[PDB]
Every structure is written in structure tokens, then in C-alpha cells.
């Protein structure tokens, strides 16, 4: 169909909670090769977050069951096999998203705020692969997640205000990557705390547009800090 139609289709699928249809429509919009508008970039992101989030959540249930079962070999064989079928769908999704970002989203991104958004997303999706890959591949995957996040982090520190919800959202997810994926709980804390304090110090730099978003992510950063600190 035509770009405007694809988008209209994606918003209907969204309302119908049919997220794979929503993802297939936004994927075709992106393959047209034109820079996504802010609204289009948000649709594509909502769509794939829901598609991949369902598999991750299932993976965690089934992995957990496959652990708690002192074999019971058969039953464990069967949970292991199911876990593998789920990983294969999860992998295929992250690879579709990662291929879109490499080929179209990151190269076309003409503003810093965009480029930061897409590199963050690239960090996120390699992070999802890292959750589920080992142990030979695992190191090279964790490294790719880190370098996407780090490059996003240097751009946003250079180009965006500390209260920008993007810069803040990136600091949230990168600090979680340090906590959960690299098992470094002091680096997580100090990344999260520095982004919290810098936003507090430059409040005046908020606008009516988004202050609501800024303050909500700050509260999430500080929640993690209190969880990690105890």
C-alpha cells in the first residue's frame, strides 16, 4: 500500500491490539527508505516492543520452569525444547529490528535526538539477544549492546539537555544493562545517579511539552537506585 495507508493500518492494528500486523505495517513504511516522522518512529517502536516483549516474557516463564525441575529428564527435555523454539522466534525478531536500524533508521537519522533514539534501541535489542545467548557468542553480543549504548550516550551528553526524556531514558536502560547484563552494580548506580542529579541541577531547561515525561523517568531512575542500594 501507500505510506499514508500503511500508517493508518498500523494505528488500527494498534487499537485492535494486533501487534504483529502493526509491526509488519511499520516495517514496510521503514523499507520505503524515507526518514520516519516522530509519530512513525513511535509506532514502529511500540509495535516491536510488544511483539518482542511477549516472547521475552514467555522465555522467562519457560526457562524458570526448565530450571526448577530436578529431572524428570523427559519433562526437562521438553521444557528445554520449548525454550529453544521460543528463543528462535525471539532471535528472529531482534534480528529483523537490528537489520532495520542498520540499513535504514540509524543512517537516515538527521537530528541528534533521533540518532540517540535509534542507537539506544540498537543497544536494547542486542541486550535482549544477550539475555538469551551463551556462552561462545555471548561476549560478542554484550559488546555490541555496550558500544551502541556508549555511542548514544556521548551524543546525548554533547547535544541534548539533561532533562530531555530521551537522554534520561537512555540513562535508565544503559544503567540496567550494567546492572543486569555486565553484573557491575557500582557502575549502574553511578550512571543512574549522575543522570538523576544532572537533571535536578538543570530544571529550568524543562518545557511544557514534556516535563511530565522527564520527571516520570527521573522517578524511575531513583527507584532503581533505591532497589540497588537498599
Amino acid at each position: 500500500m501507500d505510506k499514508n495507508e500503511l500508517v493508518q493500518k498500523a494505528k488500527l492494528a494498534e487499537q485492535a491490539e494486533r501487534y504483529d500486523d502493526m509491526a509488519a505495517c511499520m516495517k514496510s513504511v521503514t523499507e520505503q527508505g524515507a526518514e520516519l516522522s516522530n509519530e512513525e518512529r513511535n509506532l514502529l517502536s511500540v509495535a516491536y516492543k510488544n511483539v518482542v516483549g511477549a516472547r521475552r516474557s514467555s522465555w522467562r516463564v519457560v526457562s524458570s520452569i526448565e530450571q526448577k525441575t530436578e529431572g524428570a529428564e523427559k519433562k526437562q527435555q521438553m521444557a528445554r525444547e520449548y525454550r529453544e523454539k521460543i528463543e528462535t522466534e525471539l532471535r528472529d525478531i531482534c534480528n529483523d529490528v537490528l537489520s532495520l536500524l542498520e540499513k535504514f533508521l540509524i543512517p537516515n537519522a538527521s537530528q541528534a535526538e533521533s540518532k540517540v533514539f535509534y542507537l539506544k534501541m540498537k543497544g536494547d535489542y542486542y541486550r535482549y539477544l544477550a539475555e538469551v545467548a551463551a556462552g561462545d557468542d555471548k561476549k560478542g553480543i554484550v559488546d555490541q549492546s555496550q558500544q551502541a549504548y556508549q555511542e548514544a550516550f556521548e551524543i546525548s551528553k554533547k547535544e541534548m539537555q539533561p532533562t530531555h526524556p530521551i537522554r534520561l531514558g537512555l540513562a535508565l536502560n544503559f544503567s540496567v544493562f550494567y546492572y543486569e547484563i555486565l553484573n557491575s552494580p557500582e557502575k549502574a548506580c553511578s550512571l543512574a545517579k549522575t543522570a538523576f542529579d544532572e537533571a535536578i541541577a538543570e530544571l529550568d531547561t524543562l518545557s511544557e511539552e514534556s516535563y511530565k515525561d522527564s520527571t516520570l523517568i527521573m522517578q524511575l531512575l531513583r527507584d532503581n537506585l533505591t532497589l540497588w542500594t537498599s
Binding site: 517502536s45 539506544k120 536494547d124 526524556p165 531514558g169 535508565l172 536502560n173 523517568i217 527507584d223
Partner: peptide
């Protein structure tokens, strides 16, 4: 879209 969703927020 929200916070949680635009930005695929972890935790």
C-alpha cells in the same frame, strides 16, 4: 505514546 512504551523503558 507514554514514557514506558516510545522509550521501551526497562525494569
Amino acid at each position: 505514546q507514554g514514557x514506558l512504551d516510545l522509550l521501551d523503558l526497562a525494569s
